[PDB]
TrEMBL record, chain B:
The keyword Acetylation does not apply. Residues 84-105 are annotated as: Disordered. InterPro entries: NADH_UbQ_OxRdtase_FeS-su5 (IPR019342). It comes from Sus scrofa. Keywords: Disulfide bond, Electron transport, Membrane, Mitochondrion, Mitochondrion inner membrane, Respiratory chain, Transport. Belongs to the complex I NDUFS5 subunit family. Mammalian complex I is composed of 45 different subunits. This is a component of the iron-sulfur (IP) fragment of the enzyme. This is NADH dehydrogenase [ubiquinone] iron-sulfur protein 5. PROSITE patterns: CHCH (PS51808). Accessory subunit of the mitochondrial membrane respiratory chain NADH dehydrogenase (Complex I), that is believed not to be involved in catalysis. Complex I functions in the transfer of electrons from NADH to the respiratory chain. The immediate electron acceptor for the enzyme is believed to be ubiquinone. Disulfide bonds join 32-65, 42-55. One of its GO terms (cellular component) is respiratory chain complex I. GO terms for biological process: mitochondrial respiratory chain complex I assembly. PANTHER family: NADH DEHYDROGENASE [UBIQUINONE] IRON-SULFUR PROTEIN 5.
From TrEMBL, chain E:
This is NADH dehydrogenase [ubiquinone] 1 alpha subcomplex subunit 13. Complex I functions in the transfer of electrons from NADH to the respiratory chain. Accessory subunit of the mitochondrial membrane respiratory chain NADH dehydrogenase (Complex I), that is believed not to be involved in catalysis. Belongs to the complex I NDUFA13 subunit family. Signal peptide: none annotated. It comes from the Eukaryota.
From TrEMBL, chain G:
It is found in: Mitochondrion intermembrane space. This is NADH dehydrogenase [ubiquinone] 1 alpha subcomplex subunit 8. The gene is NDUFA8. One of its GO terms (cellular component) is mitochondrial intermembrane space. The chain holds residues 79 to 249 of 249 of the full protein. Residues 77-110 form the CHCH domain. Complex I is composed of 45 different subunits. Disulfide bonds join 35-65, 45-55, 77-109, 87-99. Keywords: Disulfide bond, Electron transport, Mitochondrion, Repeat, Respiratory chain, Transport. Residues 145-159 have a biased composition (Basic and acidic residues). Residues 132-163 are annotated as: Disordered. It comes from Sus scrofa. One of its GO terms (biological process) is mitochondrial electron transport, NADH to ubiquinone. Belongs to the complex I NDUFA8 subunit family.
UniProtKB/TrEMBL annotation, chain H:
Keywords: Acetylation, Electron transport, Membrane, Mitochondrion, Mitochondrion inner membrane, Respiratory chain, Transmembrane, Transmembrane helix, Transport. This is NADH dehydrogenase [ubiquinone] 1 alpha subcomplex subunit 3. The keyword Transmembrane applies. The gene is NDUFA3. Accessory subunit of the mitochondrial membrane respiratory chain NADH dehydrogenase (Complex I), that is believed not to be involved in catalysis. Complex I functions in the transfer of electrons from NADH to the respiratory chain. The immediate electron acceptor for the enzyme is believed to be ubiquinone.
Amino acid sequence: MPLVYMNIIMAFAIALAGLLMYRSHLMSSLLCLEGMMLSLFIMSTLIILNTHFTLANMMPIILLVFAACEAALGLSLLVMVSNTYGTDYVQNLNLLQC
Amino acid sequence: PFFDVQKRLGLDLDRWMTIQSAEQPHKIPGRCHAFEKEWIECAHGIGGIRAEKECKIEFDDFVECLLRQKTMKRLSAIKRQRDKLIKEGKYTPPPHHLGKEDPRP
Amino acid sequence: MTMYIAFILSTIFVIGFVGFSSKPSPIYGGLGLIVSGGVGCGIVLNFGGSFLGLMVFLIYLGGMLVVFGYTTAMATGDWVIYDTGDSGFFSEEAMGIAALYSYGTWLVIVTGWSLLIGVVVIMEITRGN
Amino acid sequence: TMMSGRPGRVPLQFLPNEARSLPPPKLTDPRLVYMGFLGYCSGLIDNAIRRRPVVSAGLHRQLLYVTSFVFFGYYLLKRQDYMYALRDHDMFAYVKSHPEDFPEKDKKTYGEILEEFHPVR
Amino acid sequence: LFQAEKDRRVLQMLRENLEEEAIIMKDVPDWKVGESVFHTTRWVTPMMGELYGLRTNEEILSATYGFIWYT
Amino acid sequence: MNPIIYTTLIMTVMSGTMLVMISSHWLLIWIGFEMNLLAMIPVLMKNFNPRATEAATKYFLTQATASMMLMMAIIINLLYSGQWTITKMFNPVAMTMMTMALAMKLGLSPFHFWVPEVTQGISLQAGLLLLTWQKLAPLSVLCQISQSINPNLMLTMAMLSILIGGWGGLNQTQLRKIMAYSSIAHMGWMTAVLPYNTTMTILNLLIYITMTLAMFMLLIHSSATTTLSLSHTWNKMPVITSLMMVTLLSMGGLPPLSGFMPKWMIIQEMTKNESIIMPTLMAMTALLNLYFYMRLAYSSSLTMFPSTNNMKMKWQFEHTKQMKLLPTMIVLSTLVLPMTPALSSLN
Amino acid sequence: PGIVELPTLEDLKVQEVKVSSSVLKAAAHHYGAQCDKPNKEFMLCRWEEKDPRRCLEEGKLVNQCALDFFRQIKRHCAEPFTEYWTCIDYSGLQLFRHCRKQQAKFDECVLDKLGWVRPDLGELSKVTKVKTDRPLPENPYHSRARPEPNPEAEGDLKPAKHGSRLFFWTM
Amino acid sequence: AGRIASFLKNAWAKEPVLVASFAIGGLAIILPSLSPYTNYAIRINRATPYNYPVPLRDDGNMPDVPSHPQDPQGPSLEWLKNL
Amino acid sequence: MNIMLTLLTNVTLASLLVLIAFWLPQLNAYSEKRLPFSMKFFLVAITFLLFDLEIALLLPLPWASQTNNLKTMLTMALFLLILLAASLAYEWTQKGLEW
Ligand SMILES: CCCCCCCCCCCCCCCCCC(=O)OC[C@H](COP(=O)([O-])OCC(O)COP(=O)([O-])OC[C@@H](COC(=O)CCCCCCCCCCCCCCCCC)OC(=O)CCCCCCCCCCCCCCCCC)OC(=O)CCCCCCCCCCCCCCCCC
Ligand SMILES: CCCCCCCCCCCCCCCCC[C@@H](O)O[C@H](CO[C@H](O)CCCCCCCCCCCCCCC)COP(=O)(O)OCC[N+](C)(C)C
Ligand SMILES: CCCCCCCCCCCCCCCCC[C@@H](O)O[C@H](CO[C@H](O)CCCCCCCCCCCCCCC)COP(=O)(O)OCC[N+](C)(C)C
Ligand SMILES: CCCCCCCC/C=C\CCCCCCCC(=O)O[C@H](COC(=O)CCCCCCC/C=C/CCCCCCCC)COP(=O)(O)OCCN
């Protein structure tokens, strides 16, 4: 396992950790999710190209498409949340408590 | 759980994309076609458990083809020893490895 | 060996992810993600994935991050693991990708249905009331 | 015993053909009677929920409930008996094919076995 | 003809690398010169680092990135 | 929304689950999960209010993170073995990340935090769908890759789920949070037998789904979301309160009720594998679930709470919409213990 | 796990073809028409043996055949071939279509001199048969012995002894 | 009969773009199934050699397989030349 | 290499010429003296994103035309375009393209 794959997985772990920190700005949560899918795309593309799995060249595009669709949904949700409060701050969603 | 509709109906919804050695377009081979072919043939019908204990040789060869850890380790050892001898001064690479060879078609 | 250019590319990618993972001033986070996406596209293109790299650079950068920034604006080592032979008179990447219409009928069906449902879901969610 | 991977198994077959060699459950089987009783209880609770005379609101509805319960119970009992028959057949075949793992114990009489005696005091 | 030339060139490069390994590894105690890393005796297509591992940097760059970088 | 749109979205959710269940390719499983995620969001927001929007966005965030972890596990598995078929996981912690993604999808501890919030935010029908149908696909995947799981991690998360559900249900006055913690504890019971017998997992899933359907339909019929709001049901529909109390006793695992069948079997199975301490601890912890079920039963039908004057008008009207399957669900969740050996049908 | 065998540097010595890709493309059609038999033997052996080391002689044979073909061209049709391959070399794509005139000159010259007829469209891509005495490799993949399959039990189904036998149920 | 013609005439006015688009899309859906040249296109795709034709080992029982490209037996491309 | 050199040259020339434009008039001394969040503009961007995704799906068409399975690829391409048209029509009839 070369160092490039390790760097990509480290990048994904950093994006996931930053998503889990939640300083503020749920928009940053969506940004972290998109960084995660970008790292997934890059490493999956590198693995597939390297092993010459010709039919697997389908998979990255599919992934991209689906992930981007998810982003759209998320953005819509964000707007409505903002549409209630005027700002996308995380701490505004304190109505529901365990 | 898993409802094997494809086998019941003979549809082949996604089995064409599962392995490297399954009818690539224009007969383009995978990098590890032979190793995967050998490992699959060895483990067919044996089952996963007996397959895991008994087809270990073919799976190890397949993994070595896929990731090539042993090959890079051997190459790195050779290069490290070559660097040691070239810093000590008892080894000189031939012109072939210096760019002074006669290239062939 | 150009000092392992892929290594520098990966390190810059990780540096960019660290840079906007602190999430400072979400437009600066988005610009860091733009730089990181450019670096990753460069990685894929240098590897040899021209079409998939261009898909990244077009779809990801020009649509998704653009819409992200638009909505935000509304608000406040190597060279060893490679091959030996050639590909023929075509690129294997293009053939495998174009196989989606001849081999991947099921993939096309499910992706198209998912995208249509995504459009419908977006309309219903953004209806408001 | 995970029998999902059993060789020669049709994926979505509720009752395989070889199950037809087993005796079907009798129509007076106690489990079938219990399934009919469950259907009758379902009918009574249905009458009670909708605020109807519990015993004598809908005779057709209660009859339909009982009949459907009996039908499903009969088929379920068939599948149950078939699966248990498969388990026993597999166990017996494995015991037959692996003699070294199931040795014949030497028959020993209590007159020649020494068991420790603990008085009750 | 191209296939024959390719096979001959690859084999000749592998022979040169084997000779250099035999010369270099003469003092390493447990080394066996030209030992396969695979259990199978089937021929395995060599990697790019198996042919160009001991060669100079410029032709390594050529063999690795020349086609990608040719515009 | 438009009834046609609602029907289409429900069919899309079910089609995503079926695509997960019938496919043998990891990418198709991920696509089915994506389809289910996409079609589920509007269902949680049928009644538009800030609470439902908050619940939907929390659910979307959790499920998207779970999907990303699932894809990373799939890609690492492909890297260490060029396989796309759903089989033995072939690798170290790639399996750990797969298990974490499936646990977040299911709501197992320590990823349980979103279930009570999403259940409280959404209505009762959305909560019914969320707590019943959304468990089939991840459990199917876990049953498929059960021989790969490390028993230590799975058993740890199962015991954590049981403990957290038991403790968190004690503090709730809202009925939806009670149902969410019950779901967490039941999933904990389900996943502790996956390393040993997947048939027991499926049996527990069937029994739990039946009990949850009966409970949610009873809660919808007597439209109460609070303990005191439920305490007013006896003055109109005492038979509903009696059926609810019987169902709550069944969910507590009391013999001879139906809810005793799974735990019993599970305990039995775990004793075949030389495991005693965990079954003992699981029973003693499910005692807490029983305690808060019994408190709800006290407040529901065993005592008569004060009523209000306007209640008299409700005496003059009858429910226009009637749930057909409610009677059957109650009987199946109450009186199916004697039919226990039917679990050989590999349900 | 074993020592890989490689042929000596002496076994890989052959009189090499030192003509550029333009010359090869200009001569390719007649080369495939005339040198078909050694080329087909080499490619059949190459696809059947799956080993470069087992097909070394055939490479020398195909090199010799190419050298003989070019020697005949040089003796009989050197000049028109020179203009033809120069024209082919000028183009950046090395297209045949720009100087059909030089191709016609070269083709008529070779037809008059050596009686060479140019293959038609779609002929060099045919799948042809090769008459060779080289033995068919019995185990080209060096496969081991496949493990024995499961005992595949068979028999007649009977009712389970004493029912399900789960706890207290008698059926 | 009359209602359909009236609807098309009303759509051809004040909505010509949609009428043209629907007509073009319907024609694109329908025409390929009726044309005789789609099989010609499939055959043309079949005759494009992207790979090396691997020769077959002769055993004396393949009268249909040529030994040389100039042999008469084997697939021909005269029809493509005629096109 | 050549593409990297070309991009570097373009960026460097643009940067240098912008800097000289921004600094030439800075050597001589002179005086040196909200919320609304329209919702339609968000729908435009979301629709663009979805249609761009479907275009990404449509992109491999030039190579898809040489597969020997022409009927299947034609069916799938027409299916994709039909669903793109259906998405457009659904968003049209739901008053999603209004101002
Ligand atoms: C061990 C196995 C063997 C035994 C099996 C045990 C289970 C069997 C039955 C299962 C369920 C089916 C029936 C239940 C439906 C409910 C309907 C109801 O309430 O009854 C009203 C109805 C009479 O009232 P009505 O005039 O119709 O109208 C009044 C309204 O209905 C209602 O009037 P109201 O609303 O004004 O009154 C209010 C009242 C009314 O509320 C209720 O009564 C609710 C009903 C109980 C809940 C049922 C839950 C589901 C079943 C679970 C069973 C648990 C068993 C396990 C052990 C745990 C014990 C909890 O509620 C309250 O007072 C609130 C507080 C209640 C106190 C605490 C609650 C505890 C209840 C638990 C009962 C468990 C045993 C039930 C036995 C049957 C009871 C009817 O009763 C009946 O007439 C039906 C009884 C059965 C019919 C028998 C006919 C057969 C005879 C002819 C055939 C011969 C047979 C042999 C053949 C060969 C011979 C020749
Ligand atoms: C909670 C009480 C249980 C009630 C459950 C609902 C009852 C209504 C269901 C109506 C009929 C459903 C049957 C479906 C028709 C055909 C099914 C067939 O095609 O599937 C077979 C399988 O059949 C079904 O699984 C059997 C379902 C029967 C469930 C009954 C068991 C209930 C547990 C005991 C409690 C007693 C309940 C009695 C009252 C109903 C093949 O399965 P297979 O592709 O090879 O492997 C997948 C399953 N694996 C992975 C677990 C091995
Ligand atoms: C049988 C079940 C029918 C009812 C249940 C429907 C379940 C959900 C609906 C989706 C299932 C539709 C079946 C499609 C499965 C794909 C495989 C099958 O179709 O064969 C293909 C045949 O392709 C056909 O053209 C498929 C055309 C059907 C798809 C067009 C419309 C699909 C719409 C279905 C629902 C989508 C959303 C709703 C729209 C209204 C493969 O082509 P083929 O050439 O053999 O092999 C290629 C491999 N080669 C290259 C090696 C040779
Ligand atoms: C399955 C076939 C698909 C292939 C062809 C289509 C491909 C692309 C075309 C469709 C793209 C999406 C179109 C969306 C349609 C929406 C229609 C709509 O709702 O708009 C109505 C108007 O639409 C209509 O008029 C209803 C239907 C009109 C006719 C539509 C075509 C029906 C058939 C006509 C041609 C038939 C075949 C061709 C033969 C013609 C002779 C050659 C209102 O217009 P407004 O803009 O809101 O005006 C308000 C401001 N004044």
